[PDB]
C-alpha cells in the first residue's frame, strides 16, 4: 500500500537549504543567498552572493541567463552565463567547493530565516523563486557567556 | 489535608496571579519580558541552556 502511485520516497525533496525552481526549460537547483550575518539584519549597502546551479532540460539547443532582478537590491552577473546543450552552469562557488557569479547589492535589509523574491530571465523562460539565506559550512558563531543571573 | 484547589492563583504573571494549568515558563512575568528560545547543551551545569 506504500508502493502505489502516491509514494513517500519518490516525492522527497533534497535535504539542502537551497530551493528548486522551474524556469521554462531550465532547472534551478540549490538556489540560496550567502550572506554572513552579525546582528538581526544584513544592512543595505552590503554585497551578498546569490548561488545556484542551472540545468538544461533540453539536450538539443543552448541557453543563456539574463537579467536577474530582485527587490532587495541589484544583481550583477559576471562570467559566461550561457548554459550548454545538456550541461550545467554553476553560478558562484558554494560552501564546500574546495566563473559566473551573481552579486547582490542590497537596498533593503535581509535576515536569515526569511525568504526573498528573485526573478530569473533566460532567453526561453522567466520565473520568481523566493530564495532563502543559507549559512553553509560556516561554524556556529560564539555566544557571549551568560553571567550568574 | 489532601484536598487542594487546582484553580488557586499561585503563579506570578504580567497580569496577576494565575492558576498553574493556565501558565508555563513561556508566560511573561512582566510586560515586555524577553524570553529566549534556549537549547540544551547536554552538559549538566556549566550553561545547560544557551541562546
Amino acid at each position: 500500500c506504500s508502493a502505489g502511485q502516491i509514494s513517500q520516497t519518490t516525492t522527497q525533496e533534497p535535504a539542502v537549504n537551497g530551493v528548486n525552481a522551474q524556469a521554462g526549460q531550465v532547472s534551478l537547483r540549490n538556489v540560496h543567498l550567502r550572506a554572513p550575518q552579525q546582528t538581526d539584519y544584513v544592512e543595505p549597502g552590503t554585497t551578498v552572493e546569490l548561488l545556484f546551479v542551472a540545468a538544461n532540460d533540453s539536450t538539443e539547443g543552448s541557453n543563456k541567463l539574463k537579467s536577474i532582478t530582485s527587490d532587495v537590491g541589484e544583481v550583477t552577473l559576471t562570467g559566461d552565463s550561457t548554459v550548454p546543450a545538456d550541461g550545467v552552469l554553476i553560478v558562484g562557488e558554494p560552501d564546500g567547493q574546495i566563473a559566473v557569479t551573481a552579486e547582490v547589492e542590497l537596498t533593503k535589509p535581509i535576515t536569515n530565516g526569511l525568504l526573498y523574491d528573485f526573478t530569473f530571465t533566460f532567453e526561453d523562460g522567466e520565473t520568481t523563486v523566493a530564495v532563502p539565506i543559507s549559512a553553509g559550512e560556516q561554524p556556529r558563531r560564539p555566544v557571549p557567556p551568560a553571567g550568574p543571573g | 489535608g489532601l484536598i487542594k484547589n487546582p484553580w488557586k492563583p499561585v503563579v506570578p504573571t504580567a497580569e496577576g496571579k494565575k492558576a498553574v494549568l493556565w501558565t508555563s515558563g513561556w508566560t511573561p512575568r512582566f510586560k515586555g519580558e524577553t524570553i529566549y528560545l534556549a537549547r540544551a547543551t547536554g552538559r549538566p551545569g556549566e550553561s545547560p541552556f544557551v541562546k
Binding site: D40, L114 | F30, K31, G32, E33, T34
Partner: peptide
Amino acid sequence: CSPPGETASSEPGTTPAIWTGSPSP
C-alpha cells in the same frame, strides 16, 4: 465533535516585528 477554537484561516499574516523588550524584572 470538533474543537470550536480551532479553525484554518486564509489571511496571510505579516513578518513579526523585531523584539525590543521592556525592563524591570
